[PDB]
């Protein structure tokens, strides 16, 4: 009365590693004393009809063994489903199951966690952080994303977006409001992502950049006329030596903040030795030229004072 | 009739994970009986017979031999090919088998540079680099070949293949390009073949097509800022050129300063027609008095007559 062993074997792959047009799965129940032995094929826990499989018993000597075969199109198999083969013997239930094997070296997943903008954190006083994950397998409801705080203090209610991409990927983003003081006084905020496809869970962390805070130094510009060529003018701003990098920058017109799409502003870039710098360009128009000739380039930054802002202006005299 | 061989393998579990030992099974079936010899080849070479073991079932006319080899998960995952070779009545029959290939691997990147305006125009010895990253860490498998749209021959290339620390291979070849040919049409083509590529890669680069426009320069100086007397910063705005490819340098005492001394930006999108960049330099005491003048130079295609533009500035 050997408890029967059950083992599944399958069509192999050709010399170059490729898959064959059909995939055969052969369930093997070997090493047993005869009787009733009932084989059954589950797909992902569901049943599929007995008319896709065949059974063969062979009794050799005292022992006994049964083999059963199920055929699969390449597509079904590459659709990554678990197929279980389940035998009933003596009231017991034995089973073995199989799906296709894991990629040995697949892509691969990127997770980005932002810090809140100096604008958002100082001016609007509604600072938020964002967690972003790209290149997940395009199946919703598998991804799990949780926020923490190093202090274990309670966190606000976040808001999630799972969005299926054009290139057959899935991108999930959750954004969180953060306690506006808590950011400034210490406080590491954590973003944790788990997926079955990922080997370990992904943790990304974010926090106030520790360092030697120094304020920005702004200078306002414009280019001399290249006359007869169209109209208007172009003007730009050089804001530099600040620490740390986090900076917001904007242009008003008589206290009207101009849309981000109006000015092209660069990303904070390093300097040889100490400090960072940005440069931002705005092309004005002849209407506002005369309307009021003043234009303001403002920098929100942590170390600016009093209000964490430094303004400046310029025209053509 | 002749018989037929198929191979079968131990299978991965529900979680799609390998087990510690991969059994491979040869099934020769459907033949006239008698002499049946089975060899196992690992990678195209014979194996020690000890872990290879045969057996033969028959009913009436139907007759099926089976041989079985066991492998360790390690050996299987070492990317070896396993050939089952059947000698029957002085003939041979074959099936081989390998680990099943990845469904969604990354995947390899390839980048082809254009030469720099500096490289073209000033020191006239332009080149392009075709760089290929994330190849499998094994040498001599890769084939990288240069060629032209014009069917005309190419200069000799130089080729490095250097194993990276993260277990990839980066193979990089630079090709001297004709300083003339580049300006008259002339698409250069880079082509890499590797066993692990489903298809050959090709990248191709050429002079960017468009309405050539010269650059406009604006030099500068900063209002002194408190606490730094002896450190002053200089600016150069360069705007509305085309195409985007632009070189930029700075000249003190009529000598080119190290490209590490200043920092230019990447030519970015104008809202209108054109492209623009910005570059800053940071000078000091010594530079103050050597002479005080500073050149901000841009080498551009549409620059004229000599393919450069320079604006001078001081304090």
């Amino acid at each position, epitope marked *: 009365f050997t408890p029967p062993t059950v083992k599944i074997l399958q069509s192999s792959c050709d010399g170059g590693g490729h898959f064959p047009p059909t995939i055969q799965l052969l369930c093997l129940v070997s090493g047993y004393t005869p009787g009733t032995i009932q084989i059954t094929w589950l797909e992902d826990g569901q049943v599929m009809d007995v008319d896709l499989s065949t059974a063969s018993t062979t009794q050799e000597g005292e022992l006994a063994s049964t083999q059963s075969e199920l055929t699969l199109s390449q597509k079904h198999w590459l659709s990554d489903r678990t197929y279980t083969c389940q035998v009933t013997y003596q009231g017991h239930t034995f089973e073995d199951s199989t799906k296709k094997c894991a990629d040995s070296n697949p892509r691969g997943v990127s997770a980005y966690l932002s810090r809140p903008s100096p604008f958002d954190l100082f001016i609007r006083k509604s600072p938020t952080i964002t967690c972003l994950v790209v290149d997940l397998a395009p199946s919703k409801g598998t991804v799990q994303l949780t926020w923490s705080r190093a202090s274990g203090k309670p966190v606000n209610h976040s808001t999630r977006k799972e*969005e299926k991409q054009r290139n*057959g990927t899935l991108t999930v983003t959750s954004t969180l409001p953060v306690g506006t003081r808590d950011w400034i006084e210490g406080e590491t905020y954590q973003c944790r992502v788990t997926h079955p496809h990922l080997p370990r869970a992904l943790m990304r962390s974010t926090t106030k950049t520790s360092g030697p805070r120094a304020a920005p130094e702004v200078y306002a510009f414009a280019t001399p006329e290249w006359p007869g060529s169209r109209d208007k003018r172009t003007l730009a701003c050089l804001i530099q030596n600040f620490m740390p990098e986090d900076i917001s920058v904007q242009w008003l017109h008589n206290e009207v903040q101009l849309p981000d799409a109006r000015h092209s502003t660069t990303q904070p870039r390093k300097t040889k030795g100490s400090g960072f710098f940005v440069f931002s360009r705005l092309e004005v128009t002849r209407a506002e030229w005369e309307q009021k000739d003043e234009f303001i380039c403002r920098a929100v930054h942590e170390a600016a004072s009093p209000s964490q802002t430094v303004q400046r202006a310029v025209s053509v005299n | 009739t002749p018989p037929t061989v198929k191979i079968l393998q131990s299978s991965c579990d529900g979680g799609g994970h390998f087990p510690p030992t991969i059994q491979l099974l040869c099934l020769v079936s459907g033949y006239t009986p008698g002499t049946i010899q089975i060899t196992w080849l690992e990678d195209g070479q014979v194996m020690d017979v000890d872990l290879s073991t045969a057996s033969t079932t028959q009913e009436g006319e139907l007759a099926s031999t089976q041989s079985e080899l066991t492998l360790s998960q390690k050996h299987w995952l070492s990317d070896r090919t396993y050939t089952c070779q059947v000698t029957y009545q002085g003939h041979t029959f074959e099936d081989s088998t390998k680990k099943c290939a990845d469904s969604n691997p990354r995947g390899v990147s390839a980048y082809l540079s254009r030469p720099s305006p500096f490289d073209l125009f000033i020191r006239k010895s332009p080149t392009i680099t075709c760089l290929v990253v994330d190849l499998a860490p094994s040498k001599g498998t890769v084939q990288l070949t240069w060629s032209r749209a014009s069917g005309k021959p190419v200069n000799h290339s130089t080729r490095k293949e250097e194993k990276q620390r993260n277990g990839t291979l980066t193979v990089t070849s630079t090709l001297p390009v004709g300083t003339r040919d580049w300006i008259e049409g002339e698409t250069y083509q880079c082509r890499v073949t590797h066993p692990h590529l489903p298809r050959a890669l090709m990248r191709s680069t050429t002079k960017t097509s468009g309405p050539r426009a010269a650059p406009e320069v604006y030099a500068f100086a900063t209002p002194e800022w408190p606490g730094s007397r002896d450190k002053r910063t200089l600016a150069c705005l360069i705007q509305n050129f085309m195409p985007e490819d632009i070189s930029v340098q700075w000249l003190h005492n009529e000598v080119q300063l190290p490209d590490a001394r200043h920092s230019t930006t990447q030519p970015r999108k104008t809202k209108g027609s054109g492209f623009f960049v910005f570059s800053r330099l940071e000078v000091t005491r010594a530079e103050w008095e050597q002479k005080d003048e500073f050149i901000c130079r841009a080498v551009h295609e549409a620059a004229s007559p000599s393919q450069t533009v320079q604006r001078a500035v001081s304090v």
Partner: antibody, heavy 127, light 112 residues
């Protein structure tokens, strides 16, 4: 180069199912980094997308939904082709059907466009 | 019933001038994703012109341009010709449908 070739019947009885297959050369149906679409055009309903199939770690399908209840796209990976099957047709299902390749261009990439097309096939629904 | 992205059924030109075609949609499609344009000279299959709002691929004329702001987009043809009479189609990827979404079509006539 890449190339797509349609084929199938051009006459379907009402209530029956249309089948049209599209074989490709110059690429693989099973390829990552691209995707395989079925589209249709009638002067009445304009140009109209039906479905898509493509492989990453698994086979995925995206249907129009719109009509997902009558349609199956699914690849024959041996013959390197993919096939559209639409159930229960009516005259409204008369159109010129196109198979097309949605994949990338290069460089910056991530950007998809359906840049390769089949000649089209005229399917007409009648008794 | 009718389509998802909205574009005017008719547009017109004179052999030297520049005309634009409008494309309106939602955030689920044009807002969070990029836009493609196609040209159709019927009995023939569609031919790609613009991709991800701004781009021109190989074998395409630079007088063909494109733009996008918010939930809408525009295709600008300048310096027209005779073979420019065509059905012109815009499309984007809608990620609340998981699917490709097209425009109604715009028939482009050139008189003169």
């Amino acid at each position: 180069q890449v190339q797509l070739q349609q084929s199938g019947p051009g006459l379907v009885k009402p209530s029956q199912t249309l089948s049209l297959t599209c074989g490709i050369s110059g690429d693989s149906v099973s390829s990552n980094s691209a995707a395989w679409n079925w589209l249709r055009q009638s002067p009445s309903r304009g140009l109209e997308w039906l479905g898509r199939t493509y492989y990453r770690s698994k086979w995925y399908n995206d249907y129009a939904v719109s009509m997902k209840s009558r349609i199956t796209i699914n690849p024959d990976t041996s013959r390197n082709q993919f096939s559209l099957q639409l159930n229960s047709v009516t005259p409204e299902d008369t159109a010129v059907y196109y198979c097309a390749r949605d994949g990338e261009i290069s460089y910056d990439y991530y950007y998809y466009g359906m840049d390769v097309w089949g000649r089209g096939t005229l399917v007409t629904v009648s008794s | 019933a009718q389509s998802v992205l909205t574009q005017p059924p008719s547009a017109s030109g004179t052999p030297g001038q520049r005309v634009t075609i409008s494309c309106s949609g939602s955030s689920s499609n044009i807002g969070n994703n990029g836009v493609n344009w196609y040209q159709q000279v019927p009995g023939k299959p569609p031919k790609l012109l613009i991709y991800y709002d701004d781009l021109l691929p190989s074998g395409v004329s630079d007088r063909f341009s494109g733009s996008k702001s918010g939930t809408s987009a525009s295709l600008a043809i300048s310096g027209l010709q005779s073979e420019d009479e065509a059905d012109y189609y815009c499309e984007a990827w809608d990620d609340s449908l998981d699917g490709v979404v097209f425009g109604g079509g715009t028939k482009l006539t050139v008189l003169g």
